[PDB]
Enzyme design. Structure first.
Site, PDB file in Angstrom:
ATOM      1  N   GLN A  98       8.591 -45.207 -52.885  1.00  0.00           N
ATOM      2  CA  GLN A  98       8.126 -45.075 -51.496  1.00  0.00           C
ATOM      3  C   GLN A  98       9.071 -45.050 -50.320  1.00  0.00           C
ATOM      4  OE1 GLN A  98       4.801 -44.857 -49.915  1.00  0.00           O
ATOM      5  NE2 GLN A  98       4.973 -43.529 -51.713  1.00  0.00           N
TER       6      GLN A  98
ATOM      7  N   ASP B 222       7.032 -55.667 -50.745  1.00  0.00           N
ATOM      8  CA  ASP B 222       6.423 -54.332 -50.692  1.00  0.00           C
ATOM      9  C   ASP B 222       7.368 -53.476 -49.868  1.00  0.00           C
ATOM     10  OD1 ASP B 222       5.249 -54.473 -47.637  1.00  0.00           O
ATOM     11  OD2 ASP B 222       5.236 -56.390 -48.743  1.00  0.00           O
TER      12      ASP B 222
ATOM     13  N   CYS C 190       2.228 -52.869 -59.333  1.00  0.00           N
ATOM     14  CA  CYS C 190       2.738 -53.612 -58.186  1.00  0.00           C
ATOM     15  C   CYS C 190       1.487 -53.737 -57.356  1.00  0.00           C
ATOM     16  CB  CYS C 190       3.864 -52.835 -57.457  1.00  0.00           C
ATOM     17  SG  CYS C 190       3.831 -50.969 -57.419  1.00  0.00           S
TER      18      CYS C 190
ATOM     19  N   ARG D 250       7.215 -49.736 -55.990  1.00  0.00           N
ATOM     20  CA  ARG D 250       8.028 -50.564 -56.905  1.00  0.00           C
ATOM     21  C   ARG D 250       7.865 -50.097 -58.378  1.00  0.00           C
ATOM     22  NH1 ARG D 250       5.630 -55.738 -53.812  1.00  0.00           N
ATOM     23  NH2 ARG D 250       3.969 -54.186 -53.571  1.00  0.00           N
ATOM     24  N   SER D 251       6.647 -49.772 -58.797  1.00  0.00           N
ATOM     25  CA  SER D 251       6.447 -49.286 -60.164  1.00  0.00           C
ATOM     26  C   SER D 251       7.210 -47.977 -60.379  1.00  0.00           C
ATOM     27  CB  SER D 251       4.977 -48.996 -60.440  1.00  0.00           C
ATOM     28  OG  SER D 251       4.160 -50.129 -60.335  1.00  0.00           O
TER      29      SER D 251
HETATM   30  O1  LIG Z   1       5.195 -50.811 -54.176  1.00  0.00           O
HETATM   31  P1  LIG Z   1       3.767 -50.454 -53.800  1.00  0.00           P
HETATM   32  O2  LIG Z   1       3.347 -49.189 -54.611  1.00  0.00           O
HETATM   33  O3  LIG Z   1       2.800 -51.564 -54.127  1.00  0.00           O
HETATM   34  C1  LIG Z   1       3.773 -50.138 -52.188  1.00  0.00           C
HETATM   35  F1  LIG Z   1       4.123 -51.246 -51.533  1.00  0.00           F
HETATM   36  F2  LIG Z   1       4.748 -49.251 -51.966  1.00  0.00           F
HETATM   37  C2  LIG Z   1       2.535 -49.576 -51.553  1.00  0.00           C
HETATM   38  C3  LIG Z   1       1.635 -50.393 -50.828  1.00  0.00           C
HETATM   39  C4  LIG Z   1       0.483 -49.823 -50.213  1.00  0.00           C
HETATM   40  C5  LIG Z   1       0.213 -48.415 -50.314  1.00  0.00           C
HETATM   41  C6  LIG Z   1      -1.092 -47.762 -49.748  1.00  0.00           C
HETATM   42  C7  LIG Z   1      -1.020 -47.420 -48.156  1.00  0.00           C
HETATM   43  C8  LIG Z   1       0.200 -46.463 -47.760  1.00  0.00           C
HETATM   44  C9  LIG Z   1       0.290 -45.194 -48.638  1.00  0.00           C
HETATM   45  C10 LIG Z   1      -0.792 -44.282 -48.844  1.00  0.00           C
HETATM   46  C11 LIG Z   1      -0.596 -43.083 -49.617  1.00  0.00           C
HETATM   47  C12 LIG Z   1       0.698 -42.784 -50.186  1.00  0.00           C
HETATM   48  C13 LIG Z   1       0.943 -41.494 -50.983  1.00  0.00           C
HETATM   49  F3  LIG Z   1       1.484 -41.801 -52.136  1.00  0.00           F
HETATM   50  F4  LIG Z   1      -0.222 -40.901 -51.274  1.00  0.00           F
HETATM   51  P2  LIG Z   1       1.876 -40.406 -50.219  1.00  0.00           P
HETATM   52  O4  LIG Z   1       1.734 -39.074 -50.904  1.00  0.00           O
HETATM   53  O5  LIG Z   1       1.426 -40.316 -48.773  1.00  0.00           O
HETATM   54  O6  LIG Z   1       3.355 -40.843 -50.238  1.00  0.00           O
HETATM   55  C14 LIG Z   1       1.744 -43.683 -49.981  1.00  0.00           C
HETATM   56  C15 LIG Z   1       1.547 -44.857 -49.226  1.00  0.00           C
HETATM   57  C16 LIG Z   1      -0.844 -48.768 -47.307  1.00  0.00           C
HETATM   58  C17 LIG Z   1       0.317 -48.973 -46.512  1.00  0.00           C
HETATM   59  C18 LIG Z   1       0.505 -50.163 -45.750  1.00  0.00           C
HETATM   60  C19 LIG Z   1      -0.485 -51.146 -45.791  1.00  0.00           C
HETATM   61  F5  LIG Z   1      -0.304 -52.257 -45.085  1.00  0.00           F
HETATM   62  C20 LIG Z   1      -1.652 -50.962 -46.569  1.00  0.00           C
HETATM   63  F6  LIG Z   1      -2.590 -51.902 -46.599  1.00  0.00           F
HETATM   64  C21 LIG Z   1      -1.830 -49.785 -47.319  1.00  0.00           C
HETATM   65  N1  LIG Z   1      -2.371 -46.760 -47.916  1.00  0.00           N
HETATM   66  N2  LIG Z   1      -3.310 -46.229 -48.778  1.00  0.00           N
HETATM   67  N3  LIG Z   1      -4.239 -45.827 -47.930  1.00  0.00           N
HETATM   68  C22 LIG Z   1      -4.063 -46.018 -46.599  1.00  0.00           C
HETATM   69  C23 LIG Z   1      -4.800 -45.741 -45.473  1.00  0.00           C
HETATM   70  C24 LIG Z   1      -4.301 -46.094 -44.205  1.00  0.00           C
HETATM   71  C25 LIG Z   1      -3.043 -46.734 -44.080  1.00  0.00           C
HETATM   72  C26 LIG Z   1      -2.276 -47.018 -45.227  1.00  0.00           C
HETATM   73  C27 LIG Z   1      -2.767 -46.673 -46.506  1.00  0.00           C
HETATM   74  C28 LIG Z   1       1.133 -47.633 -51.035  1.00  0.00           C
HETATM   75  C29 LIG Z   1       2.272 -48.182 -51.641  1.00  0.00           C
END
Ligand SMILES: O=P(O)(O)C(F)(F)c1ccc(CC(Cc2ccc(C(F)(F)P(=O)(O)O)cc2)(c2ccc(F)c(F)c2)n2nnc3ccccc32)cc1
EC number: 3.1.3.48
Length: 289
Positions: A266, A185, A219, A225-226
């Site tokens: 990302q 990830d 992913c 990754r996607s």
């Molecule tokens: O290759 P992938 O796609 O599987 C990935 F690894 F990159 C991945 C993994 C987890 C997340 C959700 C996340 C962090 C997150 C939230 C929202 C965005 C956004 F696209 F909307 P942006 O416009 O801000 O760029 C990006 C990233 C996350 C991160 C780390 C962790 F350990 C986890 F469990 C979850 N996510 N979604 N909601 C969240 C609330 C709090 C913290 C992280 C959060 C996003 C992307």
């Protein structure tokens, strides 16, 4: 001819100056934004793996059934490249049936998976396909059956042939599953070569062909990754279709793609890797076979 030498020097110039982060942050902040009201409806909370990652209302995939048509999946259609993809999150325990229902309804022929199945941690994904030929899976809620037909495990990825059946009409289809198993990830693939080889195998299978529905790509969240995978595929297509390969602007294409699903690609390293793969990949395709 030496038009790649200029892109390569350019790429090297960005590496020299260490401007990947700034380039990436500039792209991120110009990203469009659209409503995700449906994803946010209370009744859809347990259908989302992540609180902040949601499909836009305008491009979400709709399930053709009952009362709830919601699935965290977005249809990305790149007009000039003439290619569509469905980007979705790693299936949840309660959404595996929705996941295959979508594959069926959208008549997808291939599934590209870029993460690993993990039952523990914060970056998970359920075992949504059978790991044993002799133990098929039935999804009651959506009345579907899935059977593992074959599996060819390589060191960086695994290709699987599955058989999906509509328990109602009793018809069946062959779904190809391409699983890249070494993409952490927020990380990058083993190497450009391994990634390009994986991408070429997917292409060769005809799973990306306009004949079938769009390939389903996922992913864990369905964005980093996607997004990286789809961007490279798309930029490669453009570099081939276009008269001038250096005219392809990765920023422009990523921003274009981001109009369909938020957060694609990302990290700055994933952006650089993306461009590195498109450059090497284009030297292969428009190269000497
Ligand atoms: O290759 P992938 O796609 O599987 C990935 F690894 F990159 C991945 C993994 C987890 C997340 C959700 C996340 C962090 C997150 C939230 C929202 C965005 C956004 F696209 F909307 P942006 O416009 O801000 O760029 C990006 C990233 C996350 C991160 C780390 C962790 F350990 C986890 F469990 C979850 N996510 N979604 N909601 C969240 C609330 C709090 C913290 C992280 C959060 C996003 C992307």
């Amino acid at each position: 001819k030496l038009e790649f030498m200029e892109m390569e020097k350019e790429f090297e110039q960005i590496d020299k100056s260490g401007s990947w982060a700034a380039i990436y942050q500039d792209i991120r902040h110009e990203a469009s934004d659209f409503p995700c009201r449906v994803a946010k409806l209370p009744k859809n909370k347990n259908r989302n793996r992540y609180r902040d990652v949601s499909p836009f209302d305008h491009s979400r995939i709709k399930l053709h059934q009952e009362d709830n048509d919601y699935i965290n999946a977005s249809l990305i259609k790149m007009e000039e490249a003439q290619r569509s993809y469905i980007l979705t999150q790693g299936p949840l325990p309660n959404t595996c049936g929705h996941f295959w229902e979508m594959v069926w309804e959208q008549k997808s022929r291939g599934v590209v998976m870029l993460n690993r199945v993990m039952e523990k941690g914060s970056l998970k994904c359920a075992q949504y396909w059978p790991q044993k030929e002799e133990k098929e899976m039935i999804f009651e809620d959506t009345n579907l059956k899935l059977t593992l037909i074959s599996e060819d495990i390589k060191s960086y990825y695994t290709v699987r042939q599955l058989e999906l059946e509509n328990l109602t009409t009793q018809e069946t289809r062959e779904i190809l599953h391409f699983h890249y198993t070494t993409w952490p990830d927020f990380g990058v693939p083993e190497s450009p070569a391994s990634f390009l080889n994986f991408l070429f195998k997917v292409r060769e299978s005809g799973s990306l062909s306009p004949e079938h529905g769009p390939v389903v790509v996922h992913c864990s969240a369905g964005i980093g990754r996607s997004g990286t995978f789809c961007l490279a595929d798309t930029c490669l297509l453009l570099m081939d279709k276009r008269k001038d390969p250096s005219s392809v602007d990765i920023k422009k294409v990523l921003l274009e793609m981001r109009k369909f699903r938020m957060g694609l690609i990302q990290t700055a390293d994933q952006l650089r890797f993306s461009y590195l793969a498109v450059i090497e990949g284009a030297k292969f395709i428009m190269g000497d076979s």
